[PDB]
Amino acid sequence: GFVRTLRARPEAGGKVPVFVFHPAGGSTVVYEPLLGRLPADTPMYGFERVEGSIEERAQQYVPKLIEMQGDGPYVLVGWSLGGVLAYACAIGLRRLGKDVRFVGLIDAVRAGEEIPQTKEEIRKRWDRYAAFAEKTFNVTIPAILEELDDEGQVRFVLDAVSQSGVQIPAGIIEHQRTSYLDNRAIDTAQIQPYDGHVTLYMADRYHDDAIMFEPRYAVRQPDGGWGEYVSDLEVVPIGGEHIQAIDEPIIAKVGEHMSRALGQIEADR
Ligand SMILES: COCC1(CN(C)C(=O)c2ccc(CCn3cc(-c4ccc(-c5cc(OC)ccc5OC)nc4)nn3)cc2)CC1
C-alpha cells in the first residue's frame, strides 16, 4: 500500500492519530523528529507517493483515511509538498461530512508572485531545473522542439546525466525524477477554499535551491498565499529556511504548538 506506520495506535482507545504526508523526493520517515516532539503514545501514519494531480492523489488518500479513522477526528499534517496533500485531503474529508479538527502546514508556502503560464516560461522552467541538475551532479546537460510529457522533460535531463559518464546511484536518480514530477503537480494544482481551521507554520524564507528552481519563491507573503482560500488561518512563526523546518531545532517550535492543539482535541474526545 501507501500507508506507513510510524507509531501504531493501540488495539482500542488511545490518542487521536496524526496523519502525515510525504514531501517531494522523500518518505514520511522525515516526520520522526516531529513525532519526538509530540505527546507520548501519539499514533502517526504516513501517506506515501501516489501519481496524478493533487486532486487525484487526494482521491486515493481520502478513502484510506476514512477506512482508518471513520467519522474522525482528523489531524492532517504535512511539510512542503506534504502540506499541499494534507490540505487537499482536508477538502475531500470535509465534503464527505467528516470531522477535520487540525490541518498543520509546515512551511507549505505559495510563490510570492504570479507565475506566468506561457510557452516561454516552460522553457525557462526547464532551463532552471537543468542548471540545478548540473550543479548537483557536476555535469553538463546538453541543449534541448521540446513539446513532450513532464516525464519526458525530466527524463531528458537524467538520461544526459547517466550518458555523461558519471555514475549516480539509482535511488538518487529516481528520487530526482519523482521530486520533479511532484513539484509539477504543485504548480498545476487547483486549490479550493477551506472553511476549517488551518495552522501554517511559517519559516523566514525558502532555501537557495528552491529559489533556483522557481525564482518567485524568493518572495513570500505573510499568510503564505493561504488567506485567499482560508478564512480561519493561524500563522505561527518558526524562523529559519524551508529545508530546515522539518528538523531539530526548528521542529521543536512546531511540536510544542501542535502538542497543545492535540491536547485540546483530546478534551473533546
Ligand atoms: C524536492 O524538490 C526537488 C526539486 C526542486 N528543488 C531543487 C527544491 O529545492 C524544492 C523546490 C520546491 C519545493 C516546494 C516547496 N513548497 C511549495 C508549496 C506550495 C504550497 C501551496 C501553493 C499554492 C499553489 C496554488 O496554485 C498554483 C494556489 C495556492 C497555493 O497556496 C496558497 N504553492 C506552493 N509547498 N511546499 C521544495 C523543494 C528538483 C525538483
Numbering used by the authors: 1454 to 1597, 1602 to 1726
Quote from the publication.
Pks13 is a multidomain enzyme that performs the final step in the synthesis of mycolic acids through the condensation of a long-chain fatty acid (C24–C26) and a very long-chain fatty acid (C56).12 The product is transferred from Pks13 to trehalose by the Pks13-TE domain. Pks13 fulfills a critical function for Mtb by performing a condensation reaction of a long-chain fatty acid and a very long-chain meromycolic acid to form a mycolic acid. Pks13-TE is a validated target for the development of antibiotics for Mtb. In previous work, we identified TAM16, a potent lead molecule for Pks13-TE. X-ray crystallography verified that compounds from all three different series were binding deep within the active site of Pks13-TE, displacing the side chain of Arg1563 with atoms within about 4 Å from the catalytic Ser1533 OG.
The DEL screen series 1 hit X20403 came from a library of over 2.8 billion compounds. X20403 showed potent activity with an IC50 of 57 nM in the Pks13-TE enzyme assay and 0.5 μM in the TAMRA binding assay. The cocrystal with X20403 solved at 2.0 Å resolution demonstrated a similar binding pose as X20404. Interestingly, the cyclopropyl group induced a shift of the α-helix formed by residues Lys1572-Lys1588, pulling the C-terminus of the helix closer to the inhibitor by 5.5 Å, as measured at the C-alpha of Phe1585. An additional H-bond was observed between the terminal methoxy O2 of the compound and ND2 of Asn1640. The side chains of Tyr1582 and Phe1585 are within VDW distance to C39 of the cyclopropyl group. Likely due to this gross change in the overall structure of the protein, crystals obtained for the X20403 complex packed differently, and the structure was solved in the P2221 space group, containing two protein molecules in the asymmetric unit, each bound to an inhibitor.
